[PDB]
Structure 1
Amino acid sequence: STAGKVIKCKAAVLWEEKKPFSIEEVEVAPPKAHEVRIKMVATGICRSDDHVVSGTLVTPLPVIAGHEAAGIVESIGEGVTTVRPGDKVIPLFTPQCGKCRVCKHPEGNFCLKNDLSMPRGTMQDGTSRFTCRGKPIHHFLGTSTFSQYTVVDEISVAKIDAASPLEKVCLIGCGFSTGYGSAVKVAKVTQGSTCAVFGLGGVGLSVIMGCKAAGAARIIGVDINKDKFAKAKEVGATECVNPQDYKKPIQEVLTEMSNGGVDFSFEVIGRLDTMVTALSCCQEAYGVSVIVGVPPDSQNLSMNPMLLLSGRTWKGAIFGGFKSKDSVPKLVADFMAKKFALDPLITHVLPFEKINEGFDLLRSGESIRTILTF
C-alpha cells in the first residue's frame, strides 16, 4: 500500500537543456490538501515537450516534463471532492480553478492559476513533490507526466470514463483537443469554407479533423515534409502543398489557390515567419488566422498592421480554447461515442523506458504521436 507514503518510482528527468532524458528513480511525496497522486498509464510525446529540451520553451530545470497523459488515481489529499482512488484521469496542463475572472468568462480558458506564462515549475503552493538524488526536481505545467507517478493540484485533473482506453485518450490531454478546438471553437470554421493548415503533425492533423467536422469544403495542408501529406489527406485535407516546391512565397500560392485568400488559416508549427504567412494568406477583409504553434522564447515577429486594418482577425489559443476540466470528460465521452478518431494520430507505441527513442522519432520527422506506456 502507498497511500500517505513517499513513492520511489521511475521517471524521465531532464537535468539540462539539449540532453537526453535520464530514466531513474525519483521520490514522489504524498499529496497535500487538494492534491491528487496519479499512477501514469500512457503519455504522448508533444512537440512542446521537445521545446523544453531544445530551449524553445524556458522553464525551470531540472524538470519532469510531460503534459499529454492519462492515468489512475492512487490517492487523494484532504479536501479533494472531484476524483477518488481508482478513477481514470487526465492531467490538465491548463488548469480550471473555476473562481478566476477567466474561468468565469464564457469564452476564456487560460485560467490565471496556469504555470505557462511565468513558469515556477511547482505545485500551486510553490513547492515540489519530486526529488531525485537528493535534489528537488521541478514540475512542468502542474502535470509532470513523464513519471510512473505524479502529484497534481485538484484544479489540474479531470475524471474521465472508467471504460476509457488510456493509451488512446491521453491525446485528449493536449494534441487532439488543441487542434480540434482551434478549428471548431477558436476559429469557428464554417460549412463550405476554405481552410489552410500550416504544420501536419499531431496538432495540425487534429486541426484538419476539426475543419472537416465543421464542414469545410477545402482544407489545404502545408508542410515542408511531404511524407506528412498522405495522413493529412486521410483525415480530411483536400490538397497538400510544400512551400519548397514553389518559386513564389506560399502566402501568394495560397491566395491564388483560394481565389483571393482562405476563410481560416492555422499556424501549427511554431515559427514567426509562418505565423505572418498564415495571417497573410487569409482573405484580407473577412479572413481569420489562429496561432497554435509555440515559437522560440522572447522573439518578436514583424508585420504590417494593414493586414489587420482591411478586416482580418488574428487570434491564438492554448488547448483549443477548451475550459479544461469541463471539456476533457466530455471529449472522452464523445470519443467513446465514436464522434471522432484518435488512431490516425498514433504512429508509434513504445514502453516509457524508450522515451529518448520516441523523441528521436519526432525530431527525425518519422512520427506523429508516439504513446509511451508505463
Structure 2
Amino acid sequence: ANEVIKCKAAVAWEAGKPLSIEEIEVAPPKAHEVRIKIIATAVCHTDAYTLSGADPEGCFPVILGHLGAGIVESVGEGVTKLKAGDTVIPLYIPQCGECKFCLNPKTNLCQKIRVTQGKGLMPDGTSRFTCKGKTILHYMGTSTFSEYTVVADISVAKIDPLAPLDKVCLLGCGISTGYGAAVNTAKLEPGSVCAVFGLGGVGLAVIMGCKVAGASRIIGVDINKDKFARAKEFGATECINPQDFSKPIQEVLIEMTDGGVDYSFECIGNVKVMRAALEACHKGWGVSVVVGVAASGEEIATRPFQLVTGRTWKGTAFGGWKSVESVPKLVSEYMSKKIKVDEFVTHNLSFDEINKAFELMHSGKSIRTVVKI
C-alpha cells in the first residue's frame, strides 16, 4: 500500500528569502493523482517572480518548481493509463481531454483544475505536503523542488523511457514555449523574416523554431551582447543591441527589413518592448507574438492604426501545445535530433545548491541550470 513518504524538498517559507532545504512528508496519491519521483529539475523566472513576493497571487509556505522529469512512484484510485515505473514530465498546463478547451483545436488551456491549482492545492482542495507540522502548498500543479511530488493525473506526460531526464526536464516550460510560439502560434512559413527580442532560453527556443520552420532572416535583439554568440549558433542571421542606436528599436528593424519583419517575438516580459515588437512588424501582414509574461498591472499599448493597417497581435502559453499529447512528441523530436535541448544547459548543480541556480539566473550569466535531485 502507498505510504507517506519522508523526503527532502526546497521549501519557500516566505517571500524574499532563500529556499530552505527541509525534510518533509509527502502523502500518498488520492483518487486520480500521481506521485512522482523527481530526478531532475530546473529554475525559471516564474519561480523567482513568485519567490520574490512580487507576484500578487503568490502564497506561502510553498514548494516551487515547474520544470522537472521523473518516474512514477505510485498512482491513486482510478488511474489506469499510468503506473509505477513510467517515465514522465509533470505539466503546469494539463490536458483532461474532455473540457471545452481540450476539445477545441485552437487552444491548449485546459480549465479542469485551474482554480485549485491557482490556490496551490490538488483537485480535491487539499495539499499533499507537510513540514514541521505545517501544510505546505503546491505550485503550478507540479512542485518539482522535491524528491517526490504529487500531481493531478491529467498533469502528466508519459515519455520515451530512454530519454535523459537531466535534459528533458527543460521541455517542461521554456524550450517548448519558444519552439511552439514559432510553429504553433505564429505558424511562420518558409522564407519568413523574423525578429526575436530577448535572447535567453525562451528567445533561443523561438530562434530554433524559426529555423525548423525555414525562416530566411532571423534577427536577434538583446541589450546584452554576450548573448549574441549562442543566438547565432541557434540560427540567428544577425543580432543587434538597442543600446547601439539612438532611434527606437522598431525604427531600426523597419529600416533593416525595408518595411518591418513578417513575425516578431517578445521573449522578455517588458511592455515597452512588446509595443516595439508589434510596431517593428511589416505593414499589411506583420504578426507579433508576446511570449514573455509582464508584471501584474502593466499594460501594453499602441495606436489602433497599427492593427488597422495590417498588423496582428498574439500571445502564447506554453507554446500552444496540448500538453499530454504533445510533450511526448517533443521528447521524441529531441531524441531524433529534430530539436535541441542539451545546448540550453549552461550549468549543473546538486539539489542542496538550488539557491545558486536562482542567483545565476539573476546575474544573466546562464541560460538554463539543471538541478540534480
TM range (shorter): over 0.9
Q: Distance in 1 between matches of 2:115 and 2:272?
A: 23
How far off its partner does 1:303 sit? Answer: 2.4
Q: Distance in 1 between matches of 2:265 and 2:250?
A: 12
- 235-244 vs 9-18, which moves further: 9-18
How far off its partner does 1:284 sit? Answer: 2.5
The equivalences for 1:1-40 within 5 A come to 4-40=2-38
Change (3 A) 1:56 1:312: farther
The equivalences for 1:95-134 within 5 A come to 95-113=94-112, 115=114, 119-134=118-133
Report the equivalent of 1:146. Answer: 145
How far off its partner does 1:117 sit? Answer: 11
How far off its partner does 1:115 sit? Answer: 3.4
SS of the residue 2:314 aligns to: strand
Matched-pair contact (CA < 8 Å) for 2:117–2:141:
no
- 54-63 vs 128-137, which moves further: 54-63
Per-residue deviation, residues 266-295 of structure 1 (Å, max 9, x unmatched): 111111111111111111211111111111
Q: Distance in 2 between matches of 1:266 and 1:54?
A: 26
The equivalences for 1:1-374 within 5 A come to 4-57=2-55, 58-113=57-112, 115=114, 119-374=118-373
How far off its partner does 1:301 sit? Answer: 2.6
How far off its partner does 1:221 sit? Answer: 0.8
Per-residue deviation, residues 307-358 of structure 1 (Å, max 9, x unmatched): 1111111111111000000101111112111211111111001111111101
- 243-252 vs 48-57, which moves further: 48-57
Per-residue deviation, residues 100-139 of structure 1 (Å, max 9, x unmatched): 1110001210111353898211112221111112111111
Q: Distance in 2 between matches of 1:328 and 1:355?
A: 25
Matched-pair contact (CA < 8 Å) for 2:32–2:76:
yes
Q: Distance in 2 between matches of 1:118 and 1:297?
A: 19
How far off its partner does 1:302 sit? Answer: 2.9
Change (3 A) 1:143 1:220: same
Alpha-carbon RMSD? 1.4
Matched-pair contact (CA < 8 Å) for 2:116–2:125:
no
Matched-pair contact (CA < 8 Å) for 1:83–1:158:
no
SS of the residue 2:69 aligns to: strand
SS of the residue 2:51 aligns to: helix
Change (3 A) 1:351 1:118: closer
Q: Distance in 1 between matches of 2:349 and 2:148?
A: 18
SS of the residue 1:273 aligns to: helix
Q: Distance in 2 between matches of 1:364 and 1:38?
A: 32
Runs of 5+ consecutive residues of structure 2 not aligned to the other structure: none
SS of the residue 2:135 aligns to: strand
SS of the residue 2:114 aligns to: coil
Per-residue deviation, residues 116-171 of structure 1 (Å, max 9, x unmatched): 89821111222111111211111111100011100000000011111110011111
Q: Distance in 1 between matches of 2:54 and 2:215?
A: 33
SS of the residue 1:64 aligns to: coil
SS of the residue 1:39 aligns to: strand
Q: Distance in 1 between matches of 2:264 and 2:160?
A: 34
Query: If the length of structure 2 is used for normalisation, what is the TM-score?
Result: 0.97
How far off its partner does 1:299 sit? Answer: 2.2
Matched-pair contact (CA < 8 Å) for 2:116–2:122:
no
Q: How many residues align?
A: 372
Aligned-pair identity (%): 62
Matched-pair contact (CA < 8 Å) for 1:231–1:344:
no
Matched-pair contact (CA < 8 Å) for 2:182–2:210:
yes
Matched-pair contact (CA < 8 Å) for 1:115–1:121:
no
Query: If the length of structure 1 is used for normalisation, what is the TM-score?
Result: 0.97
